[PDB]
Design an enzyme around this catalytic site. Sequence first.
Site, mmCIF file in Angstrom:
data_model
loop_
_atom_site.group_PDB
_atom_site.id
_atom_site.type_symbol
_atom_site.label_atom_id
_atom_site.label_comp_id
_atom_site.label_asym_id
_atom_site.label_seq_id
_atom_site.Cartn_x
_atom_site.Cartn_y
_atom_site.Cartn_z
ATOM 1 N N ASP A 107 0.818 -1.207 0.000
ATOM 2 C CA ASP A 107 0.000 0.000 0.000
ATOM 3 C C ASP A 107 0.853 1.259 0.000
ATOM 4 O O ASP A 107 1.361 1.669 1.047
ATOM 5 C CB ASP A 107 -0.903 -0.012 1.235
ATOM 6 C CG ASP A 107 -1.807 1.198 1.315
ATOM 7 O OD1 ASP A 107 -1.936 1.906 0.299
ATOM 8 O OD2 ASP A 107 -2.401 1.413 2.396
ATOM 9 N N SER B 131 -0.783 15.491 -12.098
ATOM 10 C CA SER B 131 -1.057 15.118 -13.480
ATOM 11 C C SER B 131 -1.303 16.373 -14.315
ATOM 12 O O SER B 131 -1.846 17.363 -13.827
ATOM 13 C CB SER B 131 -2.274 14.198 -13.521
ATOM 14 O OG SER B 131 -2.687 13.939 -14.843
#
Length: 330
Positions: A35, A199
């Site tokens: 994770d 992004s």
Amino acid sequence: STGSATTTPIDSLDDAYITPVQIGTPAQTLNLDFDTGSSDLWVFSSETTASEVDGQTIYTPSKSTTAKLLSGATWSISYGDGSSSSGDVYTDTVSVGGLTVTGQAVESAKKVSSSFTEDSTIDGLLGLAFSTLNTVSPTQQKTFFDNAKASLDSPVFTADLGYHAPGTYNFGFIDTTAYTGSITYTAVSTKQGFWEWTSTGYAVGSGTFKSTSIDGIADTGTTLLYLPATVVSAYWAQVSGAKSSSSVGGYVFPCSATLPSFTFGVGSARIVIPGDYIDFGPISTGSSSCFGGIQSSAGIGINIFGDVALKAAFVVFNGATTPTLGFASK
């Protein structure tokens, strides 16, 4: 040193991925959920409340000659999806894919929430976010990666998750045969303890690319792709009959649909998520309403590039003094 381990979807939907991890001496192999959105290595154990264990493999520290109780240390974690666990702490030898760390904090669960109990395939979590998020008190502990880092050939790990198929986590090296083209690197902020990056935009299907900064985290422990409501609305508007359902808990779509792809930007590069990756199947057995793999982050407080996004790429988690993230197509 290096390590290389195969990671395997837990079910037919890729709800999560498990990776075998050797703990203790002799080795006890547990299948852990790696994770990158948390920083505790915790396991089901001989100390876990018996009624909260349902099929998991447990770590038994009393059977490990290298286990030592970390006196006074406790831990307690709550995850974004509302699940939680807590317990005490041992140090022991931990190996992943041939890479060994001695003195790793292994957090032994005394209590786990129902979601963990009900998932027989996940024996615990191995956190790969920054150690500043580790919950051990009163002495915070380091992640497996943080402990391994100085010994690694290169201070990196890579995630290469499969779509309905196994994939690989590598430590200490970049497998140049595992991706196509070049890796595009992008800046990371560690201010919140995550692999947080920005992004450069998105496209839906064959549509034009929208240049827009989307700050979010690369999180292998989250199943879906969570993005701003504007972006998510634009995606689902291209699917006939798709709608957001408060009762179901997100966007659903007719199972008869053909889903468009979703592209996200990494610098000037583009990662394409095929439409099929966005299908999470019937909302309940036999239903013709299917659950979407792209959902709104509104009310999460952060955008999350979870497995839906990451499995479309070869992803480098570069833990150099100034960390960065790299993405390549594959």
